[PDB]
């Protein structure tokens, strides 16, 4: 039995163009725990990405937060790319400052 | 308010790629304060909150030893579980554990916890009485009989009523400036037209701690549970949490909708509308 | 110590 991840991509602080911030990709609700997560800037993998220690919710499903410094702008696009045994191909969720 | 201390342990086998990884993380409420990972270059109980750093080397040394032993115990458990379910040596499997205690405002024990899941499914739990077990299936019944024979519940009870509560009280005192501080949500409502006919109202809650929160939309005072999109509460990375709730509303009807926010850090619950 | 001794399932 497997559970596919929920994915949210968002910033630590309210987004202001040109102001440094942190970009978060939160993956949750998944089982088993092996999961591949990349943060993307204009389609390319960001190298400086850290993550939380593996933990889980009361329903036993796992969650991780991946994060990195970023400075949002008008033109730059950010996204999170996730692969899991439940997914036949990597899922990409774009950063939208309204979500 | 009330508080909890919980350890969340994951052990996962990986045939052909070494021995099962064991990771244990400890929390007080929604604040992680320790981690141990057998895959760390030099495994040891490591501090993950500033208020725990004041504990001396005896705290670190003793807990590191318990966690190194727990690594071996969880590997034994995984071997045994594979047999209980007649499973192949070829597959990967997961054992998870949660244990710890809840106290009230006065520091008195509310209840204790010690329970396990295998491959994502509940397997065995210590009952609230801290004396008996609930086994999910015939495999867990083997564990139950073994633990009954060895009087394991008595040791767990002693830990949960004694050590767990004592340390939780200590942690809450040492970390009182943060663990006992509830930060209220900063809230706002945004409005996003969808079409000529409809718009999204999104109610935001940012910067709150602890994570528990209630965000709801009402239309003319009636709850809109079915028509509300609620995202899972998510960590900001600065200790605090975020959440939003959205409803699709007919153009011109925005003022019939109210967002209601309940949270421990708010003097009073909030009622927000657009603009 | 703070952490719990675990028992083999």
Numbering used by the authors:
A (entry chain B): 1 to 99
B (entry chain A): 1 to 275
C (entry chain C): 1 to 9
The authors write:
We determined the crystal structures and thermostability of a set of N-terminally extended peptides bound to HLA-B*0801, and monitored the trimming of these peptides by ERAP1 both in their free and MHC I–bound forms. To eliminate possible issues with peptides dissociating from the HLA-B*0801 groove during trimming by ERAP1, we introduced a Lys-to-Cys mutation at P7 in AAKKKYKL and also introduced the complementary Glu76 → Cys mutation in HLA-B*0801. Our structures revealed that the N-terminally extended peptides bind into the MHC I groove by adopting noncanonical conformations with residue extensions protruding out of the A pocket.
The structures show that the 8-amino acid AAKKKYCL core of all peptides, even the very long 20-mer, zigzags in the groove in an almost identical manner to the 10-mer. There was, however, a noticeable upward shift of the backbone from P1 to P3 for the 12-, 14-, and 20-mers relative to the 10-mer: Cα-atom shifts of ∼2.0 Å at P1 and ∼0.44 Å at P3. The electron density for all peptides was well-defined over the AAKKKYCL core and P−1 Ala. It is noteworthy that partial electron density for P−2 Arg was visible at 0.5σ for the 12-, 14-, and 20-mers, which was not the case, however, for the 10-mer. Nonetheless, we have omitted all residues starting at P−2 Arg from our final models. The structures also showed that all P1 Ala residues had undergone a rotation within the A pocket, as exemplified in Fig. 2B with the 12-mer. This water molecule makes the conventional H-bonds to Tyr7 and Tyr171. In the 12-, 14-, and 20-mer structures, Arg62 swings out and up from its canonical position, which opens the A pocket. Although the position of Arg62 in the longer peptides is different from that seen in the 10-mer, and small differences are seen between the 12-, 14-, and 20-mers, all orientations generated an open-ended groove.
